[PDB]
Write a protein that binds this ligand. Structure first.
Ligand code: CA
Ligand code: CL
Lengths: 461, 104
């Protein structure tokens, strides 16, 4: 397809956005200045992303195009691409593209980027055997049969579609980087064929069995976040792993992890773990996430001298002191535990994020010199004192101490009681099983600001 | 405070990464997800303003993804903000400023 005679740009390129670009691309002052076929022949690459383009009518005349970026447009029809057989690379993500038949014969393509469209039928991909990179996330694909001869593929995504059946991957032994996340995938048996896999991302699926991964010894990154994993015995064979994400599963036994000493990120939050002794030789960790488990003794963690990021929120932790070993911590999370003495945190010079809400913390003085904090949390503490004897005029000391070392005055005090530093004093006519008080005090340490708040219960005998 | 229930790892992405895209950087998390569903979004340059959509976030799961390779001698850094809402449209958190460093 070719123009004969000099022709206004705005009559080849009917799109306002695109004639504007092609005006510049071809080097012309006005969208009405004419161009000939030879002018058009010299355009071999085009970067027309993010220009609000609604049509690519006219791109057919750029017969020598090898590489195009029309990502982030409003394209639907892509029919002007049909005969551009010299195309090797297409980036066309984030359009409203439904029909990809116009791609069917673009046989020389090695890179094809189609994520965020509304594609269902990928049968037009079948003959594109030179493809080594293909991206199809965030479309509405149920059937991948059309990938079966794409035996040059190295990089492949179709995250967030509705593909259950991975059988059509069986012969793509060249694959190295695969993402199958958010599909309805239960059975990954076919992945056992993919011996060259270095990266596998399979988050938010319904995978309970990982024995297919066993011979996949070249994997260095695996993400199985949000599955139904429990037995991970298989992972002990993947000694090349450096990045392992297993959060949101049902995992309790971590011994298969012990020898995976090249790991620098491990995620294991929202599992069923009480024992982290298998973790102690993983000294190369920088990120460890252990939130939402069943932890109490976190002493194995003191070994992990390199960590800069640690999550521990929603466990059953009393003794925070192993973390004080971890001199290079920049972000620490332990909301919703049972920590009281925070004084071992004193030796965390590098801490920026300290997230310590809903624990049993009465005294902030040991955090005074943590002046690189830019994000802080300390609200909704609680504790119950050991009981004391009921007297009509019973009194207890306020123990709540701010970062300055001054006591924080109670916000409220049950049973009509009242305060004179340091003491809270009730005037109680008949036996009552318990009295209480609250506090609530805005505080900033360095540049991190929180409300330090709590409820203290006092049982009476 | 601004922390609220935010839980977010530091973000730095190598330039010239290989596909496939999008590629997960970190999962952004509000611990208010314990009271009910939280819905996640991002704003900033690289997000909703030019260059638009270099970064995206999955709105159920909080997965923050880069959608293309980066080049360090073009933009070496990016500043975004995260956002957490309930089904009701209500902020459950104060938007958090996020630094994304492009690395070697
Ligand atoms: Ca969680
Ligand atoms: Cl998690």
């Amino acid at each position: 397809a070719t123009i004969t005679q000099d022709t206004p740009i705005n009559q080849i390129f009917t799109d306002t956005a695109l004639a504007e670009k092609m005006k510049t691309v071809l080097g012309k002052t006005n969208v009405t200045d004419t161009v000939s076929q030879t002018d058009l022949d010299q355009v071999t690459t085009l970067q027309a992303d993010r220009l609000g383009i609604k049509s690519i009518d006219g791109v057919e005349y750029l017969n020598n195009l090898t590489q195009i970026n029309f990502s982030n447009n409003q394209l639907t029809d892509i029919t002007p691409l049909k005969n551009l057989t010299k195309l090797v690379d297409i980036l066309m993500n984030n359009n409203q593209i439904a029909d990809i038949t116009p791609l069917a014969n673009l046989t020389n393509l090695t890179g094809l980027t189609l994520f965020n469209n509304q594609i269902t039928d990928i049968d037009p991909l079948k003959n594109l055997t030179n493809l080594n990179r293909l991206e199809l996330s965030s479309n509405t694909i149920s059937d991948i049969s059309a990938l079966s001869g794409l035996t040059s593929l190295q990089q492949l995504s179709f995250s967030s579609n509705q593909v259950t059946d991975l059988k059509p991957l069986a012969n793509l032994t060249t694959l190295e980087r695969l993402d199958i996340s958010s599909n309805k995938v239960s059975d990954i048996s076919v992945l056992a064929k993919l011996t060259n896999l270095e990266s596998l991302i399979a988050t938010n699926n319904q995978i309970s069995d990982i024995t297919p991964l066993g011979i996949l010894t070249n994997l260095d990154e695996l993400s199985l976040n949000g599955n139904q994993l429990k037995d991970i015995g298989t992972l002990a064979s993947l000694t090349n792993l450096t990045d392992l994400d297993l959060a949101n599963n049902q995992i309790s036994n971590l011994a298969p992890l012990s020898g995976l000493t090249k790991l620098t990120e491990l995620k294991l939050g929202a599992n069923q773990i009480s024992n982290i002794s298998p973790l102690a030789g993983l000294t190369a960790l920088t990120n460890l996430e252990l939130n939402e488990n069943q932890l109490e003794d976190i002493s194995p963690i003191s070994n992990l001298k390199n960590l800069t990021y640690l999550t521990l929120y929603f466990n059953n932790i009393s003794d925070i002191s192993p973390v004080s070993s971890l001199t290079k911590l920049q972000r620490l999370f332990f909301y919703n535990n049972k920590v009281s003495d925070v004084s071992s945190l004193a030796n965390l010079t590098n801490i920026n994020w300290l997230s310590a809400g809903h624990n049993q913390i009465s005294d902030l003085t040991p955090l005074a010199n943590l002046t690189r904090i830019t994000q802080l949390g300390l609200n909704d503490q609680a504790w119950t004192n050991a009981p004391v004897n009921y007297k009509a005029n019973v009194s207890i000391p306020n123990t709540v101490k701010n970062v300055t070392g001054a006591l924080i005055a109670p916000a409220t005090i049950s049973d009509g009681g009242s305060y004179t530093e340091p003491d809270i004093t009730w005037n109680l006519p008949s036996y009552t099983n318990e009295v209480s008080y609250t506090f609530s005090q805005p505080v900033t340490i360095g540049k991190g600001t929180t409300t330090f708040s709590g409820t203290v219960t006092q049982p009476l005998k | 405070g601004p922390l609220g229930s935010w839980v977010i790892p530091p973000i730095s992405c190598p330039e010239n990464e290989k596909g496939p895209f999008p590629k997960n950087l970190v999962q952004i998390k509000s611990n208010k997800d314990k009271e009910g569903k939280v819905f996640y979004s991002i704003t900033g340059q690289g997000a909703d303003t030019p260059p638009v959509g270099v970064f995206i976030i999955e709105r159920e799961t909080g997965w923050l993804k880069v959608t293309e390779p980066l080049d360090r001698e073009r933009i070496a850094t990016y500043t975004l903000f995260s956002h957490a809402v309930s089904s009701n449209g209500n902020a459950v958190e104060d938007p958090m400023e996020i630094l994304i460093t492009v690395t070697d």
